[PDB]
Structure 1
Amino acid sequence: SRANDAPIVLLHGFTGWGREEMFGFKYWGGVRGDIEQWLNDNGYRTYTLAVGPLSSNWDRACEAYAQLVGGTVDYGAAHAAKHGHARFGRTYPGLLPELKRGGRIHIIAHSQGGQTARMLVSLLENGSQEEREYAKAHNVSLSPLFEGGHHFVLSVTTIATPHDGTTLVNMVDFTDRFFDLQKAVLKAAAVASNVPYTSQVYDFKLDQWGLRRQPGESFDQYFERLKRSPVWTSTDTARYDLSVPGAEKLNQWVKASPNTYYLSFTTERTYRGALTGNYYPELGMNAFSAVVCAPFLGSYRNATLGIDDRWLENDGIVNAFSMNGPKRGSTDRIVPYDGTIKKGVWNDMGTYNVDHLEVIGVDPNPLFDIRAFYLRLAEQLASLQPHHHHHH
């Protein structure tokens, strides 16, 4: 059924790190193994992007663009001046120079990665008018990313993505709990949060903000500085983009490309309480989510905000209702999968009973055939037709 040869590129969310980080414990595979290696082993050429887990989708897309084709990250002169961080970031050799020669990729994105992938597609195709106009008005140079006209992306697949935000950000103790989540992923990787490791271990890639863990600093201490830093206090952050208002703002400009396939997977790991209408964690959900996040997600309503009952089912971290595609402030279409994947529309591939971390293998779930999950997805992506023609 193989109808294209595009390689697959994997993209994490508000947690995530390179293949060499976390002592080789993989974000994509966790305690289950190495998802990229499984795909490559099965004949599906697969790569992995690592970008700032806490950075805005904008920053991450700029980082992803430079990580793909090579070069020094360029966040755009207008954006950098706007938010007060460096215009230029780290330099990359480029994972896929074939992209500079018409090649295309499939992106498989988990969590906030889904937002980033969508945004990258948009900047690639449309560029940024704001940047272009700023470059002409200030006589500054312009990254090719902002010119538009790039078509690197044949498909985007999002898994557990908060396309409409997650109400988790609304928790009153969200900042302290969000970083506890980072601590919980570290723990999953068997990494302590109260130890000043001399090796990097987990690089948050805050080059633009000039933030990095210092010698003698544990992750606990590091996170306490991050909490008070601009990567947590600004609107140019994952924290803002993850929020319902922030995701809506994102949706208002980040539209689905008619040249690109979109697949969404929804995840859920909760049950409904008959008398309260709330949703509750099941048995099997990662311990941190079950205790600290799922109860809030499954009970938080806010009429002002648009959060009614539909939002309560969740995967421990993200409202399921947010996952099938952008809706809030979005002109994108979403169709249930009907056997045939269509261009320029969100193909809701269905809802899977796995939690936010289980779906990438970071939390165990031996009832979830994760190997089969990604293999079946790879097959589906490789079957996507470059072209279509009307028929009866």
Structure 2
Amino acid sequence: CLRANDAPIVLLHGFTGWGREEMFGFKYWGGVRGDIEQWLNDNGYRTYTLAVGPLSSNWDRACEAYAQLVGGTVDYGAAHAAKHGHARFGRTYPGLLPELKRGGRIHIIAHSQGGQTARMLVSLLENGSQEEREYAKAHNVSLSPLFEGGHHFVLSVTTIATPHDGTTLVNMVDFTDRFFDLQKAVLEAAAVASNVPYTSQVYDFKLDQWGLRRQPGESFDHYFERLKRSPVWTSTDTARYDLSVSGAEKLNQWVQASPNTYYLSFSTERTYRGALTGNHYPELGMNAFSAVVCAPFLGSYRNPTLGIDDRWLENDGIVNTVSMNGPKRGSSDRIVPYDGTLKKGVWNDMGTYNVDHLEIIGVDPNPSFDIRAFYLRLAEQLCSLQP
């Protein structure tokens, strides 16, 4: 790289994901292929990993990301917490990069719903929250600096297989059961059983604000049955809602691109069209869970009420490919095909890759995908960005 900025890289997972000490060290970023953070660091690209609530709303996850980056106690905002009935304060972090408070900046590389979270964190840093500012005045409580506005420390957001317009998977019948089957499948990829009541946490869902935690003598099977019936699955303040086509559009209506930030999007597809009616079908090698449980629905579900037609049928096993190049539904962001120069304040569509939702992070194998070269080439591009 010809280095133009010194900003560290920050990895951010989707609606599954866990810290480097979790899952007995099986890495979400790298999976069965290795340790992407370690590869980037070993190649001279300083990289860190964020771990936030996988099932929690993008709002909560953005507040957690902020505290984890600059240090301190997660503050979800007094108004937000009162409106949805969960704790105002989350856990306390030492802070990965306190220098963000004095002028440092970062590149965020986000997978799946991580891309919504990274977008939202930028929006909150730039504009704050009018509602939280007003509520703090009215009720004489403190206000997180995150909601003040006029802050800036994200130089770029890169999203990979992100459902910026949602995924129609949420509309599948029995989505609740199949989604937590997906969680168990990822646990099994990590060689972690779902019917064993581990005494260590192994996979912390970080639901402190909701007061939820896997109990002593409780298996993931039993825990997920509880989670299904909990507010983190049944409220609007959830990843599940933000993942829907409707919820993603609502998010897009206020989370917009900042002129001070480069946005890069990577799309993923792992399907073919058949010759019967033009439906899409999983290619050989797509991870087994998606191939059997999710891809047939994704490549055949049409919904005229929500504008879900033939453009939505291509998919990566989890997300409709059309959803990934940037926010569109309810969004005024601009999306431009990458042309050799990356532009600020717009989505640079870096193209589509023939890699499925879990292969792109190495949680499922794909020997024809040079995952190491993919992330090293991305880090070079970010290293080259003009500050």
TM-score, normalised via structure 1 length? 0.98
* Structure 1 stretches of at least 4 aligned residues deviating more than 3 Å after TM superposition: none
- Please give the secondary structure, in 1, of the residue aligned with 2:117: helix
Secondary structure of 1:305's match?
coil
Provide, for residues 204-260 of structure 1, a one-character-per-residue CA deviation record: whole Å limited to 9, x for no partner: 000000000001110000000000000000000000000000000000000000000
For 2:315 and 2:156, the matched residues in 1 are separated by: 25
- Alpha-carbon distance, 1:53 to partner: 0.1
Q: Give CA-to-partner distance per residue, 1:185-212, whole Å, 9 cap, x none.
A: 0000000001111111000000000000
Deviation at 1:97, TM superposition (A): 0.8
Q: Distance between the aligned counterparts of 1:272 and 1:206, measured in 2?
A: 40
Residue by residue, what CA displacement relative to the aligned partner does 1:325-372 show, whole Å, maximum 9, x if unpaired?
000000000000001101100000000000000000000001000000
Deviation at 1:76, TM superposition (A): 0.2
Cα drift, residue 137 of structure 1? 1.2
**Deviation, structure 1 residue 16:** 0.1
Q: Distance in 2 between matches of 1:149 and 1:37?
A: 33
Cα distance in 1, alignment partners of residues 203 and 277 from structure 2: 40
Which residue number in structure 1 is paired with residue 85 of structure 2?
84
Larger CA deviation: 272-281 vs 25-34: 272-281
| Identity between Structure 1 and Structure 2 (%) | 96
Cα deviation, residue 306, structure 1: 1.1
Q: What is the alpha-carbon distance in structure 2 between the residues aligned to residue 10 and residue 151 of structure 1?
A: 18
Aligned counterparts of 1:244 and 1:134: Cα–Cα separation in 2: 30
Tell me which moved more, 131-140 or 63-72.
131-140
Q: Quote the Cα distance in structure 1 between the aligned partners of 2:143 and 2:307.
A: 38
**What are the equivalent positions in structure 2 for 1:35-114 lying under 5 Å apart?**
35-114=36-115
> Partners of 2:62 and 2:270 in 1: how far apart?
29
Secondary structure at the aligned position of 1:259 is classed as coil
Q: Equivalent residue of 1:61, what SS?
A: helix
CA deviation after TM superposition for structure 1 residue 165, in Å: 0.2
CA distance in 1, matches of 2:141, 2:278: 55
Q: CA deviation at 1:98?
A: 1.2
Whole-angstrom distance in 1 between the partners of 2:278 and 2:142: 54
Take 1:338 and 1:377, find their aligned partners in 2: how far apart are those partners?
15
Shift in Å, 1:149: 1.3
Q: Deviations over 1:143-183 (max 9, x none)?
A: 00000111110000000000000000001110000000000
Provide the alpha-carbon RMSD of the alignment: 0.5
Where 1:10 maps in the other structure, the secondary structure is: strand
The aligned runs of 1:179-190 (5 Å cut-off) are 179-190=180-191
- Structure 2 residue aligned with 1:252: 253
Alpha-carbon distance in structure 2 between the residues aligned to 1:257 and 1:359 = 27
Q: Distance in 2 between matches of 1:363 and 1:132?
A: 44
CA distance in 2, matches of 1:274, 1:258: 44
CA–CA distance in 1 between the matches of 2:139 and 2:332? 33
Task: Tell me the CA shift for residue 284 of structure 1.
Answer: 0.6
Partner of 1:389: none
CA distance in 1, matches of 2:209, 2:307: 34
- Once the 2 structures are TM-superposed, how far is the Cα of residue 274 of structure 1 from its aligned partner? 2.2
Q: How many residues align?
A: 385
* Correspondence for 2:137: 136
Please give the alpha-carbon distance, in whole angstroms, between the structure 1 residues aligned to 2:202 and 2:110.
22
Instruction: Please state if 1:121 is matched with 2:99.
Output: no
Inter-partner Cα distance in structure 2 for 1:213 and 1:306: 39
SS at match of 1:48: strand
Rounded Cα–Cα distance in structure 2 between residues aligned with 1:118 and 1:56: 13
SS of residue paired to 1:304: coil
Q: Where does the alignment leave 5 or more consecutive residues of structure 1 unmatched?
A: 387-392
Task: Give, in angstroms, the shift of residue 138 of structure 1.
Answer: 1.2
Distance (whole Å) between structure 2 residues aligned to residue 345 and residue 135 of structure 1: 33
Matched residue of 2:6: which SS?
Answer: coil
- Shift of residue 95, structure 1, vs aligned partner: 0.5
Structure 2 unmatched runs, 5+: none
| 2-structure distance, mates of 1:380, 1:202 | 33
Alignment partners' CA distance in 1, 2:326 and 2:274: 26
Deviation at 1:114, TM superposition (A): 0.2
Q: Distance in 1 between matches of 2:81 and 2:298?
A: 34
Residues in 1 aligned to 2:275 and 2:86: alpha-carbon distance in whole angstroms? 49
TM-score, normalised relative to structure 2: 0.99
Distance of 1:95 and 1:293 partners within structure 2: 36
Secondary structure at the aligned position of 2:90 is classed as strand
